[PDB]
Amino acid sequence: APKAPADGLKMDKTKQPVVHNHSTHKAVKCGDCHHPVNGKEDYQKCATAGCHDNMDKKDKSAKGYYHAMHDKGTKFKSCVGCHLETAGADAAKKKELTGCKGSKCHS
Ligand code: HEM
Ligand code: HEM
Ligand code: HEM
Ligand code: HEM
């Protein structure tokens, strides 16, 4: 089985880079994020060519990188989508986990 990498991983395809820690996500199954493609969980970098390689932040296709990290209603929960559910009605956790600035994702 593939192993989780070290914490402190920077996602840096954009000018708004974000650090991802596997240890804080250890209760989420690996394949919720490294989701099936052609029937197999895919552990390539999310923006690999042919994957979420469209860097237009307005794109909502299966290639849109921004969309895959921020939007609701997606086949797999996105970073923000899952965090909204986690925060619930708690506005402090909404700021921390889903705020566009001043949050745990973006300063
Ligand atoms: C579950 C224990 C689990 C495994 C296994 C796993 C593996 C993994 C690898 C091998 C990488 C590095 C990919 C590379 O070649 O650089 C990696 C990276 C990311 N992961 Fe992961 N991962 C596991 C679990 C989870 C969970 C539960 C999430 C989602 C909450 C998740 C997400 C990510 C992200 C994002 C990356 C960075 C990929 C990128 O920037 O393209 N992982 N993981
Ligand atoms: C990297 C860890 C990674 C993330 C994050 C990610 C997210 C993601 C979401 C949120 C969706 C749903 C979008 C929607 O509008 O429903 C989604 C869908 C697909 N992805 Fe993805 N994805 C990550 C990694 C990868 C990799 C490495 C590839 C390419 C091999 C890839 C591809 C796709 C495709 C295709 C879809 C659509 C799948 C289908 O409808 O069953 N993703 N991804
Ligand atoms: C998507 C790639 C993604 C990112 C980025 C991300 C970030 C993140 C941060 C920065 C935290 C705070 C802790 C830390 O610094 O590591 C955090 C915390 C939680 N997350 Fe997350 N997260 C991403 C994805 C997802 C997804 C897809 C889920 C659920 C399916 C999820 C869940 C959680 C949970 C739960 C936490 C803990 C919340 C807290 O209050 O302590 N994340 N994430
Ligand atoms: C709040 C809804 C919110 C906004 C708005 C937002 C914006 C934003 C921008 C403009 C980028 C860069 C896009 C580009 O291509 O130029 C970006 C990138 C990432 N974000 Fe974000 N973001 C908002 C909220 C959050 C939160 C709360 C998280 C984490 C749960 C998060 C995550 C990400 C990730 C991952 C990226 C990509 C980082 C990279 O590869 O450089 N965003 N966001």
Side-chain angles (χ1 to χ4, degrees), residues 1-5 9 20 22 28-49 51-52:
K3 320 123 53 177
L9 178 167
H20 185 69
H22 276 76
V28 176
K29 106 167 141 45
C30 311
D32 283 2
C33 295
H34 302 291
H35 63 73
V37 179
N38 295 313
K40 306 176 180 222
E41 290 173 355
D42 205 294
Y43 288 84
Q44 295 171 281
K45 287 192 161 73
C46 314
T48 294
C51 300
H52 301 281

Side-chain angles (χ1 to χ4, degrees), residues 40-71:
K40 306 176 180 222
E41 290 173 355
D42 205 294
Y43 288 84
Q44 295 171 281
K45 287 192 161 73
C46 314
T48 294
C51 300
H52 301 281
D53 61 358
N54 188 335
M55 294 292 152
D56 184 290
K57 69 179 173 180
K58 298 196 175 43
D59 183 59
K60 307 292 184 194
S61 84
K63 300 179 195 285
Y65 183 74
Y66 179 97
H67 167 68
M69 311 302 166
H70 295 85
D71 286 349

Side-chain angles (χ1 to χ4, degrees), residues 6-7 16 20 23 26 39 42-43 56 61-63 71-72 78-79 82 93 95 98 103 105:
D7 283 353
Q16 311 304 327
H20 185 69
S23 68
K26 70 178 157 173
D42 205 294
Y43 288 84
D56 184 290
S61 84
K63 300 179 195 285
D71 286 349
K72 305 176 49 181
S78 69
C79 312
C82 181
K93 283 283 179 186
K95 171 64 166 174
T98 69
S103 68
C105 301

Side-chain angles (χ1 to χ4, degrees), residues 10-20 25 47 54-57 65-66 68-70 78-81 83 94-101 103-106:
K10 196 181 288 196
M11 301 174 76
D12 59 13
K13 307 308 296 188
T14 81
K15 293 183 189 182
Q16 311 304 327
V18 173
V19 169
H20 185 69
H25 294 91
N54 188 335
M55 294 292 152
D56 184 290
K57 69 179 173 180
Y65 183 74
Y66 179 97
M69 311 302 166
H70 295 85
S78 69
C79 312
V80 174
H83 286 193
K94 283 189 225 169
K95 171 64 166 174
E96 287 174 49
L97 297 177
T98 69
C100 306
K101 60 183 195 75
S103 68
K104 292 189 173 279
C105 301
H106 295 305

